Amino acid sequence: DDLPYRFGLGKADITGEAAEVGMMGYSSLEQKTAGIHMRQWARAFVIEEAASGRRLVYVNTDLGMIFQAVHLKVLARLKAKYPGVYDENNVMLAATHTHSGPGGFSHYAMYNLSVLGFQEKTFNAIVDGIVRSIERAQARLQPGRLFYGSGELRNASRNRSLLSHLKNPDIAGYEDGIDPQMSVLSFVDANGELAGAISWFPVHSTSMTNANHLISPDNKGYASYHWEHDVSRKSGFVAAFAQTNAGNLSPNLNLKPGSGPFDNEFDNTREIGLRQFAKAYEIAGQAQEEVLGELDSRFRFVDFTRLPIRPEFTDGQPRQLCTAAIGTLEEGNNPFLSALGGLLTGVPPQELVQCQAEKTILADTGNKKPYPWTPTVLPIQMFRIGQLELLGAPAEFTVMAGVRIRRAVQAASEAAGIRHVVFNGYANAYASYVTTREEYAAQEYEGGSTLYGPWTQAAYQQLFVDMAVALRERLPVETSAIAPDLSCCQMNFQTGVVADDPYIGKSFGDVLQQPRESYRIGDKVTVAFVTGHPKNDLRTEKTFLEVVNIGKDGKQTPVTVATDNDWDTQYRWERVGISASKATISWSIPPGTEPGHYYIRHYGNAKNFWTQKISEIGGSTRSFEVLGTT
Ligand SMILES: CCCCCCCCCCCCCCCC(=O)O
Ligand SMILES: [Mg+2]
Ligand SMILES: [Zn+2]
């Protein structure tokens, strides 16, 4: 015949600087990276219509957000290497909204504030890994089928701003403040075995708190890892856990037996990840509806400055968006904030005060010079995948802000044969929060980070409906406005690596703490090595550590059984004295590990003060025995 689509699945490492960079999400000057729990990945899904095609690519990333700077550079790189294949119309980048990665990868000052500015090494790793994930995906194209399903996930999330949610007049089906809908797009190969999947479900990826310093992809990242590493059987499975409208949704409390909820953020991350995984796996297993039909897409950069909004989307009067403002730790420090001005002096312009409505302005970000602290030109994008439409929206939408847009788009698209509309927030840029008009009036946290005023949600609804109508009628969307390039003029106040020295009387790679003679399943092995600063080399597609199996004995050929990516391992870096440092590596030995002999290897990099040369360093522990059974 035969198969309606081809798809390609790819994954690549986008982990940034693992020590001494402010983390992105919690806005803390006292949350710097200090190691890795699990790495961050870009997971790319290339889809081609056999009829056609007509190729689309969707990439979900283990990041707090995908900033405009990343989107622009990724597109340029794709156009340079693969001319005519990819552009803004057929590439969607989205983020899981983990709050446990290194920051500094926006070009807008607001989002770099707590990080003390732009961190080029982390930015570059993100861009490069997103591109590598697409390269890997497109090199693995195969014929297959696509299925769609949905279901209700009850106990994974909770509304964190319920007072505002309840101000909406239209909350039937959302009376608990939760959007319980999970949607799954499954990728079924010519065998039809499940080759990969994308799950969409809204919940903040904040199980690892602002007290944590280890890099982690958080609860959605655990869901992906559990599917790829613990569950599939097949290689190489790619499972993305993506967001929808999560602006006002937090992980539910973890009240599983024997746990306080509070007691252990790793347990919480695993539990909330597992709750999402279990539902995604259930839905995929149902293969509810085969996806059939054309691939299509639209994309527009929209200038938000004085954007007119038609009365059909507002209270019934014509409206216009406001320039950006935030409503009501630097301190202290913050030299980057100081280089920006920093906070004050208002009163802001009267026109701004007036049209921001119930907001009490804390910072007038839109009027900052030479550059606004927040974006002004924002991407709006939609993919059609058979009877599915997937929307990529550049912000955090509350449940009702997203639901209203979904409803409006489904109404506009029904005649085109669309039956399911999936709203993917955190896509292509990041412009803070979107609350409905009613929520905005309450001015809880999400209101007050709704930058463009009370009609921000109405603007997005208009933009998406107009795009849906263009798709329906065939026909282009309006010409894109011109996304500002701020690459020239990025500031940074985060110091780098001066140099590394080994511990006095030792060499890089020397073992500081050897493992015990023997351990049992369930025990944690902790070892430590003289190291150098992880800012020297991200060890992209490699590792800071290996757990190595050498057999029952002997004497057997070494086989790596765990890397720094794995849930069961941790890598921690800490400064010792002026220029020395230690790498502490742990392994929690999981059920099912073979009894036998093991050791731990460390890989790192060190910088010479005099030459500035960066070299490879490393070491291996003595062996230890895991005791048990089979
Ligand atoms: C107000 C909207 C109409 C104006 C749009 C400007 C037309 C130029 C766009 C050309 C790019 C091709 C757009 C996709 C068209 C299609 O495939 O249906
Ligand atoms: Mg690990
Ligand atoms: Zn958020």
XYZ file of C-alpha atoms and ligand atoms in Angstrom:
650
model
C 0.000 0.000 0.000
C 1.273 0.996 2.437
C 1.917 3.019 5.618
C 0.491 6.561 5.918
C 3.461 8.267 7.623
C 7.141 8.041 8.229
C 8.504 9.112 11.607
C 11.941 9.544 13.133
C 12.752 9.641 16.840
C 15.925 11.201 18.194
C 17.307 12.259 21.571
C 20.332 14.408 22.438
C 22.006 15.833 25.518
C 21.319 19.542 26.271
C 22.751 19.539 29.841
C 24.466 22.808 30.689
C 26.973 23.937 33.320
C 26.847 21.556 36.327
C 28.424 23.797 38.921
C 28.259 27.473 39.893
C 25.463 28.691 37.617
C 22.131 29.993 38.965
C 19.271 27.609 38.217
C 16.293 28.594 36.050
C 12.757 28.764 37.466
C 12.978 29.714 41.151
C 14.561 33.193 40.659
C 17.047 32.537 43.434
C 20.528 34.041 43.764
C 21.295 31.189 46.189
C 20.410 28.233 43.975
C 23.506 27.433 41.963
C 24.160 24.099 40.269
C 26.318 21.676 42.233
C 26.106 18.454 40.212
C 23.812 16.209 38.221
C 21.046 13.901 39.265
C 19.853 13.161 35.726
C 20.800 14.834 32.454
C 18.593 17.101 30.339
C 17.553 15.926 26.847
C 15.970 17.213 23.683
C 13.593 14.585 22.256
C 12.736 15.148 18.590
C 9.859 13.669 16.619
C 10.021 14.074 12.869
C 6.793 13.216 11.046
C 6.383 12.978 7.288
C 3.296 12.376 5.237
C 3.971 9.541 2.823
C 1.602 11.429 0.394
C 3.340 14.344 0.635
C 5.544 14.904 2.553
C 5.492 17.537 4.028
C 7.578 17.095 7.103
C 7.047 18.479 10.608
C 9.368 18.266 13.583
C 8.351 18.619 17.230
C 11.059 18.792 19.909
C 10.353 18.619 23.629
C 13.201 19.741 25.908
C 14.099 19.121 29.561
C 14.338 22.905 30.225
C 12.476 25.552 32.235
C 11.417 27.107 28.956
C 12.470 27.606 25.374
C 13.513 31.153 25.027
C 13.303 33.183 21.831
C 17.126 33.282 21.613
C 17.284 29.459 21.453
C 14.443 29.284 18.893
C 16.126 31.832 16.606
C 19.561 30.194 16.742
C 18.201 26.682 16.302
C 16.313 27.820 13.179
C 19.388 29.509 11.736
C 21.457 26.354 12.342
C 18.830 24.163 10.694
C 18.667 26.473 7.666
C 22.465 26.476 7.351
C 22.846 22.703 7.461
C 19.580 21.520 5.841
C 18.473 24.225 3.405
C 14.866 23.970 2.256
C 14.043 21.234 4.762
C 13.228 23.152 7.949
C 12.082 26.615 8.821
C 9.840 28.457 11.282
C 6.750 26.904 9.720
C 7.609 23.274 10.456
C 9.734 23.222 13.616
C 8.130 23.400 17.097
C 10.264 23.598 20.237
C 8.662 23.091 23.653
C 9.843 22.655 27.230
C 8.861 20.493 30.199
C 9.261 23.471 32.628
C 11.690 21.716 34.952
C 13.027 24.172 37.535
C 16.278 22.253 38.067
C 18.474 23.216 35.116
C 21.200 25.883 34.804
C 19.859 29.279 33.665
C 21.182 32.114 31.520
C 19.891 31.041 28.137
C 17.439 33.860 27.422
C 18.401 37.105 25.770
C 15.764 39.003 27.823
C 17.039 40.437 31.049
C 14.023 39.475 33.221
C 14.639 35.774 32.729
C 18.397 36.003 33.390
C 18.151 38.207 36.534
C 18.829 35.611 39.265
C 21.543 33.972 37.091
C 23.415 37.343 36.902
C 23.055 37.441 33.098
C 23.676 35.374 29.970
C 25.577 32.091 30.282
C 26.954 31.382 26.822
C 28.212 27.811 27.469
C 24.788 26.631 28.684
C 23.016 28.486 25.856
C 25.296 26.962 23.251
C 24.851 23.399 24.653
C 21.071 23.802 24.458
C 21.110 25.030 20.854
C 23.602 22.395 19.787
C 21.747 19.528 21.465
C 18.363 20.545 20.042
C 19.909 20.540 16.570
C 21.632 17.168 17.271
C 18.282 15.646 18.384
C 16.707 16.610 15.023
C 19.706 15.288 13.104
C 19.382 11.995 14.955
C 15.637 11.833 14.394
C 15.811 12.535 10.673
C 18.533 9.845 10.231
C 16.116 7.287 11.751
C 13.044 7.854 9.576
C 10.856 4.728 9.276
C 7.351 3.912 7.999
C 4.627 3.738 10.610
C 1.245 4.584 11.999
C 0.181 7.278 14.441
C -2.425 6.849 17.144
C -4.093 9.372 19.423
C -5.832 8.840 22.773
C -6.841 10.740 25.865
C -7.808 10.048 29.479
C -8.317 11.653 32.835
C -5.456 11.768 35.340
C -6.930 12.676 38.777
C -4.316 12.684 41.567
C -1.094 14.062 39.979
C -1.795 17.832 40.157
C -3.529 20.557 42.138
C -4.489 24.143 41.452
C -2.187 26.563 43.272
C -4.379 29.615 42.679
C -7.879 28.237 43.187
C -9.363 31.568 44.307
C -8.660 33.086 40.859
C -9.781 29.970 38.977
C -13.169 30.149 40.711
C -13.702 33.676 39.366
C -14.326 32.186 35.892
C -18.030 31.778 35.000
C -17.312 28.802 32.732
C -15.611 26.050 34.781
C -17.835 22.992 34.234
C -15.528 19.959 34.034
C -12.846 21.943 35.941
C -14.612 22.482 39.294
C -11.594 21.013 41.180
C -9.305 23.580 39.456
C -7.471 20.738 37.643
C -7.199 20.016 33.944
C -7.189 16.237 34.219
C -6.796 15.599 30.500
C -3.760 13.728 29.301
C -3.409 13.245 25.513
C -0.965 10.786 23.929
C 0.366 10.650 20.370
C 1.879 7.217 19.855
C 4.288 6.201 17.149
C 3.766 2.621 15.989
C 6.332 0.980 13.709
C 5.901 -1.435 10.763
C 5.844 -4.292 13.342
C 3.365 -2.425 14.994
C 5.338 -2.194 18.078
C 5.306 1.068 20.008
C 8.452 2.995 19.029
C 7.874 6.239 20.955
C 5.221 8.557 22.333
C 4.421 12.118 23.308
C 2.238 12.663 26.416
C 0.639 16.097 27.056
C -0.535 16.799 30.594
C -0.306 20.033 32.636
C 1.579 20.063 35.940
C 4.500 22.228 37.088
C 7.765 20.316 37.018
C 8.740 21.616 40.451
C 8.977 18.438 42.528
C 12.681 19.252 43.057
C 12.538 22.411 45.163
C 14.609 25.602 45.349
C 16.729 23.832 48.002
C 18.081 21.394 45.438
C 21.312 22.050 43.558
C 21.527 18.962 41.344
C 20.548 19.188 37.681
C 17.348 17.295 37.110
C 14.583 17.037 34.503
C 12.137 16.715 37.450
C 8.882 14.804 37.394
C 8.283 14.839 33.610
C 11.894 13.873 33.085
C 11.457 10.914 35.445
C 8.373 9.816 33.483
C 10.401 9.832 30.226
C 13.343 8.039 31.850
C 11.098 5.429 33.467
C 9.495 4.639 30.075
C 12.739 4.648 28.064
C 15.023 2.969 30.619
C 12.827 0.833 32.913
C 9.758 -0.100 30.791
C 10.436 -0.425 26.986
C 12.083 -3.497 26.056
C 12.616 -1.881 22.613
C 15.550 0.343 21.593
C 15.691 3.193 21.100
C 12.393 4.238 22.654
C 11.720 7.967 22.919
C 9.059 9.181 25.340
C 8.360 12.903 25.711
C 6.240 14.269 28.561
C 5.042 17.692 27.407
C 2.973 20.470 29.035
C -0.433 21.926 28.174
C -1.954 24.775 30.207
C -0.068 24.435 33.536
C 0.182 28.075 34.648
C -1.803 27.540 37.841
C -1.091 23.821 38.401
C 1.370 22.306 40.891
C 2.264 18.696 41.664
C -0.194 17.166 44.080
C 1.013 16.435 47.623
C 2.644 13.025 47.944
C 0.661 11.235 50.641
C 1.643 7.701 49.626
C 2.018 5.324 52.629
C 5.022 5.937 54.885
C 5.860 9.291 53.347
C 5.571 12.827 54.637
C 5.088 15.100 51.685
C 7.913 17.362 52.378
C 10.193 14.437 53.478
C 11.994 13.707 50.256
C 11.913 15.679 46.999
C 13.461 12.785 45.073
C 10.649 10.474 46.262
C 8.126 13.194 45.246
C 9.730 13.583 41.799
C 9.604 9.826 41.233
C 6.015 9.497 42.489
C 4.533 12.362 40.428
C 6.523 11.129 37.430
C 5.167 7.631 37.922
C 1.580 8.918 38.148
C 1.997 10.607 34.748
C 3.790 7.632 33.268
C 1.094 5.177 34.378
C -1.653 7.160 32.677
C 0.363 7.705 29.463
C 1.152 4.022 29.266
C -2.537 3.143 29.851
C -3.704 5.528 27.108
C -1.053 4.451 24.575
C -2.051 0.835 25.286
C -5.638 1.604 24.211
C -4.528 2.911 20.713
C -7.790 4.795 20.774
C -8.001 6.454 17.378
C -5.702 6.142 14.354
C -4.424 9.526 13.113
C -5.043 9.889 9.379
C -4.839 12.770 6.940
C -2.656 15.664 5.878
C 0.194 17.378 7.637
C 0.061 21.176 7.593
C 1.224 24.097 9.644
C 1.237 27.855 10.138
C 3.593 30.169 11.987
C 3.734 33.891 12.673
C 5.885 36.232 14.722
C 3.395 38.743 16.185
C 4.292 42.193 17.449
C 2.414 42.435 20.789
C 3.020 46.204 21.134
C -0.376 47.966 20.807
C -1.928 44.833 19.358
C -5.604 45.492 18.563
C -8.080 42.965 19.933
C -11.476 42.544 18.280
C -14.612 42.856 20.477
C -15.593 39.196 19.882
C -12.723 38.226 22.246
C -13.044 40.885 24.953
C -15.935 42.315 27.009
C -17.518 43.526 23.755
C -15.428 46.641 23.246
C -12.333 46.937 21.044
C -9.191 46.625 23.176
C -5.410 46.960 22.781
C -2.646 45.157 24.641
C -0.458 47.160 27.098
C 3.312 47.135 27.018
C 4.756 44.655 29.502
C 4.709 45.095 33.254
C 5.029 42.883 36.318
C 2.697 43.409 39.275
C 3.139 43.109 43.037
C 17.849 38.288 46.568
C 18.509 41.744 45.153
C 18.897 42.959 47.563
C 21.510 41.961 47.187
C 23.448 41.271 45.155
C 22.683 41.907 42.213
C 25.236 43.531 39.894
C 23.277 42.539 36.798
C 20.134 44.231 38.108
C 22.280 47.287 38.930
C 23.709 47.352 35.371
C 20.104 47.388 34.183
C 19.040 50.362 36.303
C 17.782 48.475 38.291
C 14.362 48.405 40.044
C 12.599 51.820 39.769
C 12.027 54.705 39.405
C 8.305 54.890 38.620
C 5.563 56.126 38.736
C 5.198 54.454 35.279
C 3.454 56.358 32.436
C -0.234 57.039 33.216
C -1.430 55.275 30.071
C 0.337 52.119 31.254
C -1.015 52.346 34.827
C -4.504 52.747 33.393
C -4.600 50.005 30.877
C -2.848 47.397 33.184
C -6.179 47.580 35.104
C -6.163 45.807 38.479
C -2.414 45.259 38.434
C -0.258 47.269 40.811
C 2.889 47.700 38.801
C 6.134 46.567 40.420
C 8.320 46.748 37.302
C 7.646 48.418 33.965
C 9.637 45.909 31.877
C 8.359 47.027 28.457
C 9.713 50.575 28.685
C 13.247 49.634 29.782
C 16.076 50.962 27.590
C 18.008 50.181 25.457
C 16.139 46.864 25.539
C 12.883 45.872 27.230
C 13.426 43.257 29.967
C 10.676 41.104 28.459
C 9.796 40.067 24.865
C 7.587 42.046 22.487
C 7.494 39.893 19.325
C 6.130 36.421 19.982
C 5.741 33.223 17.944
C 2.303 31.740 17.342
C 2.290 28.294 15.696
C -0.055 25.435 14.858
C 0.602 22.004 13.370
C -2.121 19.927 11.776
C -1.412 16.192 12.116
C -4.376 14.423 10.467
C -7.475 15.140 12.603
C -5.219 16.613 15.325
C -4.149 20.192 15.753
C -1.241 20.988 18.011
C -0.812 24.578 19.180
C 2.527 25.952 20.318
C 2.045 28.891 22.710
C 4.960 30.947 24.138
C 3.829 31.276 27.740
C 2.344 29.579 30.849
C -1.423 29.462 30.400
C -3.750 28.785 33.291
C -6.270 25.959 32.885
C -9.127 28.214 31.700
C -6.862 30.454 29.602
C -5.785 27.372 27.635
C -9.177 25.659 27.662
C -10.911 28.748 26.217
C -8.399 28.842 23.342
C -8.745 25.101 22.738
C -12.562 25.456 22.554
C -12.370 28.435 20.209
C -9.899 26.693 17.886
C -11.879 23.429 17.864
C -15.018 25.421 16.900
C -13.139 27.143 14.053
C -11.465 23.909 12.884
C -14.371 21.430 13.017
C -15.236 22.049 9.343
C -11.614 21.241 8.389
C -11.991 17.756 9.900
C -10.146 18.525 13.135
C -11.383 16.448 16.078
C -8.767 17.058 18.775
C -6.897 20.232 19.691
C -3.837 19.908 21.915
C -2.566 23.090 23.569
C 1.206 22.988 24.182
C 2.350 25.949 26.360
C 6.057 26.738 26.912
C 6.713 26.600 23.133
C 9.123 28.624 20.942
C 9.560 31.573 23.375
C 8.723 32.467 26.945
C 6.593 35.452 27.908
C 5.595 34.624 31.492
C 1.940 33.885 32.419
C -1.500 34.051 30.821
C -4.574 34.320 32.938
C -8.203 34.877 31.813
C -9.716 38.381 32.210
C -11.464 37.200 35.406
C -8.357 35.563 36.868
C -6.302 38.642 35.992
C -8.588 40.824 38.131
C -7.757 38.767 41.232
C -4.004 39.425 40.784
C -2.694 36.263 42.385
C 0.822 35.297 41.211
C -0.151 34.344 37.641
C -2.049 37.585 37.329
C 0.626 40.158 37.824
C 2.919 38.024 35.722
C 0.396 38.404 32.890
C 2.626 40.908 31.142
C 0.460 42.601 28.529
C -2.544 43.468 30.692
C -6.061 42.188 31.263
C -6.672 41.265 27.610
C -3.522 39.156 27.147
C -5.609 35.965 27.050
C -8.103 37.497 24.581
C -5.158 38.447 22.303
C -3.851 34.872 22.264
C -7.336 33.529 21.593
C -7.752 35.901 18.627
C -4.310 35.001 17.271
C -4.926 31.255 17.457
C -8.465 31.471 16.059
C -7.264 33.587 13.131
C -4.477 31.035 12.460
C -6.975 28.137 12.646
C -9.242 29.912 10.134
C -6.262 30.449 7.796
C -5.478 26.689 7.981
C -9.129 25.852 7.340
C -9.391 28.152 4.323
C -5.922 27.265 3.164
C -4.468 30.746 2.815
C -1.428 32.305 4.519
C -1.350 33.981 7.895
C -0.251 37.629 8.040
C 3.424 38.392 7.375
C 5.696 37.831 10.374
C 7.188 40.712 12.265
C 10.821 40.686 12.815
C 12.017 39.094 16.098
C 14.586 41.434 17.705
C 18.149 40.064 17.740
C 19.650 40.875 21.134
C 22.671 38.627 20.658
C 25.161 41.564 20.404
C 24.566 42.997 23.769
C 24.218 40.368 26.488
C 25.610 41.149 29.939
C 27.050 38.716 32.465
C 28.256 39.056 36.053
C 28.804 35.380 36.838
C 32.522 34.658 37.186
C 34.040 31.620 35.426
C 36.809 29.172 36.250
C 40.108 30.853 37.207
C 41.999 27.544 37.439
C 42.048 24.113 39.086
C 44.653 22.510 41.301
C 44.574 19.041 42.844
C 44.389 18.601 46.617
C 47.762 19.320 48.202
C 49.879 16.194 47.930
C 47.499 14.502 45.496
C 46.721 14.293 41.767
C 43.515 14.889 39.812
C 41.496 11.624 39.810
C 42.877 10.370 43.124
C 40.294 8.558 45.266
C 39.365 10.472 48.440
C 36.759 7.969 49.644
C 36.881 4.313 48.626
C 33.782 2.108 48.665
C 33.205 -0.372 51.503
C 34.115 -4.066 50.961
C 30.543 -5.147 50.221
C 26.961 -3.898 49.866
C 23.449 -5.314 49.574
C 20.658 -4.350 47.199
C 19.041 -1.170 48.520
C 22.311 0.177 49.912
C 23.842 3.438 48.734
C 27.524 3.370 47.639
C 29.307 6.741 48.112
C 32.777 7.460 46.790
C 34.767 10.622 46.049
C 37.626 11.840 43.827
C 39.957 14.860 43.500
C 38.477 16.686 40.495
C 38.347 19.856 38.383
C 35.494 22.277 37.701
C 32.617 20.872 35.543
C 32.328 24.332 33.839
C 35.507 23.299 31.998
C 33.636 20.678 29.907
C 29.904 19.741 29.985
C 30.801 16.223 28.937
C 27.989 16.384 26.385
C 26.913 12.848 25.245
C 29.397 11.533 27.799
C 29.467 11.212 31.594
C 31.118 12.281 34.831
C 30.765 8.767 36.196
C 30.372 5.117 35.334
C 29.333 2.176 37.522
C 31.266 -0.738 36.075
C 30.408 -4.446 36.439
C 33.431 -6.823 36.271
C 31.555 -10.024 37.008
C 30.785 -12.623 39.613
C 34.034 -12.592 39.641
C 36.217 -12.352 37.599
C 38.062 -10.796 35.879
C 35.178 -10.422 33.404
C 35.293 -7.808 30.633
C 34.061 -4.490 32.154
C 30.445 -3.524 31.374
C 28.989 -0.162 32.352
C 25.686 -0.569 34.184
C 25.071 3.078 35.131
C 26.045 6.544 33.949
C 25.459 10.069 35.364
C 22.103 10.114 33.547
C 20.616 7.326 35.632
C 18.129 7.890 38.488
C 20.170 5.591 40.791
C 23.358 7.728 40.511
C 24.323 11.214 41.674
C 27.315 13.425 40.904
C 28.100 16.278 43.288
C 30.837 18.874 42.873
C 32.169 21.116 45.619
C 34.904 23.680 46.000
C 37.718 22.745 48.392
C 39.925 25.626 49.546
C 40.771 28.168 46.830
C 41.256 26.111 43.671
C 40.729 22.438 44.499
C 37.490 20.466 44.322
C 35.916 17.098 44.960
C 33.496 14.960 42.994
C 31.251 12.850 45.227
C 29.519 10.035 43.362
C 26.819 7.793 44.723
C 24.961 4.732 43.521
C 21.776 3.473 45.128
C 21.852 -0.230 44.193
C 18.403 -1.056 42.754
C 16.407 -4.330 42.887
C 17.572 -6.646 40.134
C 21.304 -5.806 40.143
C 23.458 -8.892 39.601
C 25.518 -10.022 42.584
C 29.230 -9.657 41.788
C 32.092 -7.162 41.694
C 31.821 -3.513 40.664
C 33.810 -0.302 40.698
C 33.161 3.379 40.016
C 35.026 5.458 37.426
C 35.128 9.267 37.400
C 35.764 11.483 34.357
C 36.354 15.251 34.707
C 38.362 18.175 33.307
C 40.852 20.591 34.834
C 42.089 24.089 33.828
C 45.767 25.233 34.106
C 46.053 28.813 35.482
C 49.160 29.676 33.477
C 48.318 28.271 30.054
C 44.509 28.237 30.402
C 44.618 24.732 28.852
C 41.766 22.390 29.791
C 42.773 18.707 30.172
C 41.015 15.397 30.745
C 41.313 13.906 34.235
C 39.975 10.703 35.768
C 40.211 7.915 38.310
C 38.735 4.573 39.363
C 37.852 3.173 42.798
C 38.905 -0.224 44.033
C 36.295 -2.933 43.443
C 33.430 -3.700 45.861
C 31.039 -6.656 46.020
C 27.293 -6.609 45.701
C 25.902 -9.554 47.695
C 22.488 -11.173 47.201
C 20.979 -13.966 45.135
C 20.553 -14.679 41.435
C -3.784 38.855 6.261
C -3.298 37.475 5.830
C -3.064 37.399 4.323
C -1.692 37.938 3.933
C -0.631 36.842 3.922
C 0.597 37.259 3.121
C 0.853 36.260 1.996
C 2.324 35.865 1.929
C 2.614 34.585 2.710
C 3.335 33.568 1.837
C 3.835 32.367 2.631
C 2.997 31.123 2.353
C 1.946 30.987 3.453
C 1.242 29.636 3.492
C 0.193 29.548 2.386
C -0.366 28.147 2.340
O 0.402 27.152 2.282
O -1.607 27.962 2.353
Mg 22.372 10.118 37.958
Zn 5.732 28.282 35.921
